Design a protein around this nucleic acid. Sequence first.
RNA 1: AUUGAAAUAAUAAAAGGUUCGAGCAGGUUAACAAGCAUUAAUACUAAAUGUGUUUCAUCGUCUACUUAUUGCUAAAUUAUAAUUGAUUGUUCAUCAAAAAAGCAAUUCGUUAGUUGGGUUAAAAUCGUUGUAAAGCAGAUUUGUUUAUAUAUUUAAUUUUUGUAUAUAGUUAAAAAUUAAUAU
RNA 2: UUUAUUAGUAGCAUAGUAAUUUAUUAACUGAUUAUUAAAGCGUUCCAUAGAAAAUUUUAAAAUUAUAACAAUCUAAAUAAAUAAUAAAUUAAAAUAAAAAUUUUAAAAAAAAAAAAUUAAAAUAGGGCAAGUCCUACUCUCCUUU
RNA 3: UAGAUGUUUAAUGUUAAUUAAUUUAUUAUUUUAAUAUUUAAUAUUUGUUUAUACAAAAGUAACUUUUUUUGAAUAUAAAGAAUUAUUAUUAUAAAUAUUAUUUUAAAAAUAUAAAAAUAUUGUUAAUAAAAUUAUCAAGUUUCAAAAGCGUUUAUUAAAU
RNA 4: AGUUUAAUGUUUAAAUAUUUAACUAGUGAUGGCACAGUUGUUCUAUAUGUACCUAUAAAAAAUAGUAAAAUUAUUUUAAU
RNA 5: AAUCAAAGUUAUUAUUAAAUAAUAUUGAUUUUGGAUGAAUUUAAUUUUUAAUUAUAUUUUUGAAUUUUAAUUUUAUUAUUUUGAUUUAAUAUUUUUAAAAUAUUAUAUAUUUUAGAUUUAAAUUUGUUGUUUUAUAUU
Lengths: 39, 113, 55, 176, 167, 101
Amino acid sequence: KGWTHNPGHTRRGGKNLAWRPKISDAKLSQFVPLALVHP
Amino acid sequence: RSDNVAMYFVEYKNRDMSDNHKGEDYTAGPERFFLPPRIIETEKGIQRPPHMQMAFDRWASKFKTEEFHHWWRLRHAKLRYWGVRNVPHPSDVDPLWTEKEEEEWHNEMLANT
Amino acid sequence: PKRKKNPMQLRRKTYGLHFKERYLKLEEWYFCPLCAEPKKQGEWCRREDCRQIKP
Amino acid sequence: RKALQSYPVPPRARNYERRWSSSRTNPYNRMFWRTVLNEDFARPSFWVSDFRHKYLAKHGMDYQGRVPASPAPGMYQGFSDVHKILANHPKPQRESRHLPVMPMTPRVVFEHAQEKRIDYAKKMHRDRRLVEQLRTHEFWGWYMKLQRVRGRWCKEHGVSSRGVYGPAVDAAELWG
Amino acid sequence: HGKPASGHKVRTQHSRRWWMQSKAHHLTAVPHEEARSRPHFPAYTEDVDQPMVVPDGVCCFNCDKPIDGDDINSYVWVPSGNARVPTTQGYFFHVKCFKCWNCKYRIIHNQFYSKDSRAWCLSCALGRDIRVPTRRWHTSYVNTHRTGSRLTGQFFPRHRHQMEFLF
Amino acid sequence: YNSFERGWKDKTVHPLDRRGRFNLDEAAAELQLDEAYVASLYKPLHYTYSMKGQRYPAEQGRTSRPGSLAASRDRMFPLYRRNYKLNRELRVLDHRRISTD
RNA sequence: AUUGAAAUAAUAAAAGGUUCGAGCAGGUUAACAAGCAUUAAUACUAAAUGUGUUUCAUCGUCUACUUAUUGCUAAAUUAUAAUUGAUUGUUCAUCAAAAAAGCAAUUCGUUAGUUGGGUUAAAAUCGUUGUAAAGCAGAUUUGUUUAUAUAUUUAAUUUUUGUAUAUAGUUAAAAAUUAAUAU
RNA sequence: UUUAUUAGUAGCAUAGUAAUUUAUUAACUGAUUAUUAAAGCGUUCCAUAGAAAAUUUUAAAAUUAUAACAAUCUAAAUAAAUAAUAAAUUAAAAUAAAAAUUUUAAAAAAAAAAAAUUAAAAUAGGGCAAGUCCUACUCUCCUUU
RNA sequence: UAGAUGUUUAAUGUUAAUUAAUUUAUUAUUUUAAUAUUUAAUAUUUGUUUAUACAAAAGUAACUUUUUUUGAAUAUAAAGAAUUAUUAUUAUAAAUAUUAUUUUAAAAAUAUAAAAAUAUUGUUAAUAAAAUUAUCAAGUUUCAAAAGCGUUUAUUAAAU
RNA sequence: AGUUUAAUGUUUAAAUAUUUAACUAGUGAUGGCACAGUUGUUCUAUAUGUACCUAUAAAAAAUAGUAAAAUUAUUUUAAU
RNA sequence: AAUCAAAGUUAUUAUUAAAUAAUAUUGAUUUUGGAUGAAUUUAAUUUUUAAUUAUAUUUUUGAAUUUUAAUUUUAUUAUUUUGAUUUAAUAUUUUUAAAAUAUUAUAUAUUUUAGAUUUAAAUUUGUUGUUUUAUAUU
Ligand SMILES: [Zn+2]
Ligand SMILES: [Zn+2]
Ligand SMILES: [Zn+2]
């Protein structure tokens, strides 16, 4: 009842790297433009 | 007809250099299975090695009896007990080899006469 | 089977290239010049002429 | 299940019982050692073990001799199925002096029907090998005609029957 | 305290005290613990050392009539291991001369007692008197031509026979 | 099977036992064994002696059919007719051999 | 209406629950095992096999065992398994279990409840589903969408100096040994 | 409170993995000592052999590690049964629900193997209702010897 | 449109006084009973090759002409599991018959295991009574608990 | 070599068979005929007495409205 | 790729069933015994193969009930000689067995696409389509 051959929490579906890049939201949030001006 | 297994005809290569099957024909099987195979008429003048064609009729000798003509009659009852379609009744299976088919061959051994 | 199949279920059976290729295909053939009988290629008779030179 | 009293002779193999014992064969060779070794096991078979009690009374002694077998004529005349009040011996006789004759009980006749069907079986086997020692005996005798007529033919036609090579590959007595 | 202390006798044929009580003590060398165990005897006693053939000066022990040489299994050839004394090989009897001489019925369980060159039934030859069997009276149950006697006696290594591994 | 289509035929009848043609009665004369008896050795013992046996139904022969006459089990299989002289002479106990009075 | 008790392997005709979209009483006092509102969901555990969560500084979640198979801890391996949730008809049956018994225990008895040894656990896969495939191809790929992802059983370097009573930090080698493209 | 002999955490009502000792790297094992055992107990106890446990130890079954097709069990051609079957063109998938497990409703999407769902199951498992059954004893009642 | 405020059949349908177009309108979404489908392009089936005993029950789908004896009479091949199926019906006896029913070009499971280095119980509720073998098929030992060897429908300190 | 186990089989070749473990020593027992249903038999398990002992077979209309399954005819004409 | 809505006729053969009717009846489907019988025996004071015109009484208070109808008088146990009469029912087998309309990136049959959706019955004791039954044809 232990020792999985497959360690880690690599999710199943969210793999497109364009609409869900594998970047920790801690390091990805710093690009969310909270002063967005041109559009 | 009994299953879609294919049927190849494996034959040894050149027989015109043989000594036993010199000019035989295989377009059709022997009539009764104890009868020697039809020969190409262009080479009808062929005789065989005796040890081959004297031991054959030694074997073919058992089907020329009536005890096999009883085992033939009988077998047709088995194939009906096991019902196999299209098997004639053992009452109309008149023998393979017979006395009328005896007279030719004893007079076809004119070599030893 | 927890349901019976309407024909439109039985009819989808006849669309895949498995039904078609198994049942509904005509075989390519031609006349064996020696036997004058229909014949497929690569197959021959039990007969000297048909067996020496493949018709 | 076909009560044993129906069989001419009681059956040879006698099946028993014993959910926790699985073996067809009755253990003979144990029923034999007892009986041969212990005299008492089998009931005396009255006569051969009477005739004392009739010697002791009339002679004042133990018989002290081997008792005659084959009970005297006239003994056990009212008995009908003796077979136990005896050994399996026949009912002795009448009280006569006529030559001994087996009273053809249904049992004795059956034994006759064995010793004829024993001679029958040993005769159907004894002459299978007698004709089997013609078929194979004469097949060989004929087969050597074959290797002779093949032996004669294979010299004029020169087929050495030893490969594509000439005898010069043989004379080396190697593989080649 | 595993509870079901009364049991099935589950072992027994899985012991080493068993493996020594299953052997046969036959007439071979086969020191011990090497003889066959389940059937108690090896099939096909090889006898290349001495050919073990039926002799020519052969005769019935019980009847004394000469016996067919070897073309037949009408004779019950009991080779009592190495016998020599009854004949060059062991006692010989036609199948129908295999009865007890004194009581004249069959030799029950086939153990006979050679009384002065006439096989006597063990029970009569022993003094007992019950003198008629049930099944077959005047013909024993025996096998013919040693085929019933090859459960015992003289398997292949009948001696030291070390010629094998020596030079 | 040199058939190219297996069936109740072209099943090579004996692809062994090449030593055919046994003249039993002729050979039985050498052994002096009652020619009628020897030939019985070489067919299932059902067919000759009064023994319990299993027969095929076609072997039994049919009633007179519209297509074929009554084909008795004998006239189609002559050498299978039981010989009850040869049975009795060999297998059954005669009154004679046990006549005691 | 003319006594009181039992499981009898109790049953037959019905619905309706123990294991729950909500309840109850006995774990350091208090947060938690869990005797009543549904409903062929037809026991706990193990094996295998997944999963969406959520949880500090990269960033994070692969331990294997002993005793008992109860389940969850104790505790041994230097150092020791995040927490929730949905999960097991595929696999076992150990437990729990239906006069086969027995022990102590309650019964006037029939019997009842602890404990131990016993005690079938199962059908041709139709739909969905998914893994593959459809015989095809001179060519990976524009966009869909992703079983697929480098580390969590620790060494030896090297800087052990910075800082202070001991001493860090990028890395590298080795180890856990394997590679991945539908028109 | 028969409880003396005797064995006693034992198929011994809980208390428990009994407390000690060993044994194991780790002892809910098992064995030992004694001994107030919820209420064993003289038909007790000892002795005890193939049985079921506990060690030690050795060992071929492919026991973990571990994955490792040699063998036999085609397709096609032929014959043609079975459980089950209200329907389907929806079925997916995500989310809320409201009585329920979720299934619906709604929104919003968008050939062959395996057993996740549909009932992959049979049939066991409950407990309640009315009905009948069967067994039991100081309290009910006949046919009763 | 069409009575009205929603649950008790309309019948001279050949004038049951019939006589060439009555065009019969009346049919129970389940029950059994009979058919037909689905599962089903299927599950089973598949006939290539040969190691002899004889009784009685049991049958009688059963053909007939065949030479039974020296007995009057009497009668001699075939079962049961629903079947031509697992299936030597073991009453006997015997021992060399060249007696004769088994489709086929693949990998998944699975039934199954030839072969093969290490490791030896770490697997598991629990290894060790667990097919055959010519490499000839067998674990040893200690302790504790435990009677008789028979006998049992959930197989034993059952009952003898 | 037919029988306390295990695998396979799971409408299976079987409404118990295949392979296999165990066991196997019956002068005391598959077996002449004999006991029959409120009862036989029981080395006693409420077991069996012809493939569920609740015996079969036979004869009833027992009860079942006290949450079982059903109960056949559209176009209506007073409500709760 | 995908759909597409779809065939009502066998052809040919003749004296049962059911109730009813108030005349017979020693046990239906070979030839007892076949020694000479002892072996081929079903009988007795009870709602029975016997079948009875009232609502008052009386009654364990509650399932219990009415007495000749004309004394041999007809309510009585029954068919051949109208295919025996009548009315209801009607077949059963042999071998028959059939057919040409809706897309082209997908919710469900209407031609002109879009609109459209409890399958019903029960059960709902409004735990209010509560997990029950139905493959279809007659
Ligand atoms: Zn041709
Ligand atoms: Zn002799
Ligand atoms: Zn003697």
